Write a protein that binds this ligand. Sequence first.
Ligand SMILES: Nc1nc2c(ncn2[C@@H]2O[C@H](COP(=O)(O)OP(=O)(O)NP(=O)(O)O)[C@@H](O)[C@H]2O)c(=O)[nH]1
Ligand SMILES: [N+]
Ligand SMILES: [N+]
Ligand SMILES: [N+]
Ligand SMILES: [N+]
Ligand SMILES: [N+]
Length: 303
Amino acid sequence: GFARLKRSLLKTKENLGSGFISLFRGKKIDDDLFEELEEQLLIADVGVETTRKIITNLTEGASRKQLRDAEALYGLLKEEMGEILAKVDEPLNVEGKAPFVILMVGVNGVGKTTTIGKLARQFEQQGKSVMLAAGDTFRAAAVEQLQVWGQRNNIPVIAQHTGADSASVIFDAIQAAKARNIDVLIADTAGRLQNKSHLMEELKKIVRVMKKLDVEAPHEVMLTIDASTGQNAVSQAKLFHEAVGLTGITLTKLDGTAKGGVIFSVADQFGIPIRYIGVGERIEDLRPFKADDFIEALFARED
Ligand SMILES: Nc1nc2c(ncn2[C@@H]2O[C@H](COP(=O)(O)OP(=O)(O)NP(=O)(O)O)[C@@H](O)[C@H]2O)c(=O)[nH]1
Ligand SMILES: [N+]
Ligand SMILES: [N+]
Ligand SMILES: [N+]
Ligand SMILES: [N+]
Ligand SMILES: [N+]
């Protein structure tokens, strides 16, 4: 089973899941084993704190059951790491709002704009009308690229002149979405980390201004982070979550990176639903995150 996701996770499986099998083969459970496993979890970008929790719980579980052979730790690890991901398995539901507003936050270069387009096309295939807001207002090339994409896909894009107030652009986009019976409004935002506190104030202003039109907006504050950036994804998530409060995460570029284990650090550190994982270039390769599929793909040795 899960042959496709196993292929997407091939490089990550070298260290996690089925990658554990060679580590445990023929070994006893002792402090040396747990030191080796800790090292491998850290190399896989699971993170110092999440790795410490896993090791602590495995040690107690192995001792409680008086396990002898390292091979038995495999199933315990599958349970511990599977529970981490199951706690953030909650798909995004965009139904029933006029419009449902998604505020897309994150730094530049991690897949935010790509994810906006994939989400927009997915919602359209579901029968929904979509509109985009070009709220990254000081990056003229990025605004223009979003407008070009919208024109190519017959999806309206609300934009103002270079340097416009992002909260004003997004307010106008909500007004336009309401006026034109739009089902989903996806708002792009700036992603410059230079002087990060200014960006966070910009995002908080966007959120405050939305409430004049709909106290429920934004219905989703979605972070986009890039698994190939390792623990940078975790520090980005902490920055945005402490600043504005996330309600969902998209983790991109899981295909081909050996750093996919960062998903456990993101899940455990914040407890925010992971809505989507990116595993390729097609629209359909932005996949709703399913924790069981993910853990089975990672830990299975068959194909
Ligand atoms: N291999 C892979 N690449 C992805 C995935 N999602 C996004 N990307 C790629 O990552 C790059 C960054 O995409 P983009 O959306 O342009 O990034 P951004 O966060 O808006 N800012 P910038 O314009 O600097 O890129 C693009 O080349 C994109 O095609 C994914 O899921 N897998
Ligand atoms: N950590
Ligand atoms: N939905
Ligand atoms: N300017
Ligand atoms: N405001
Ligand atoms: N691959």
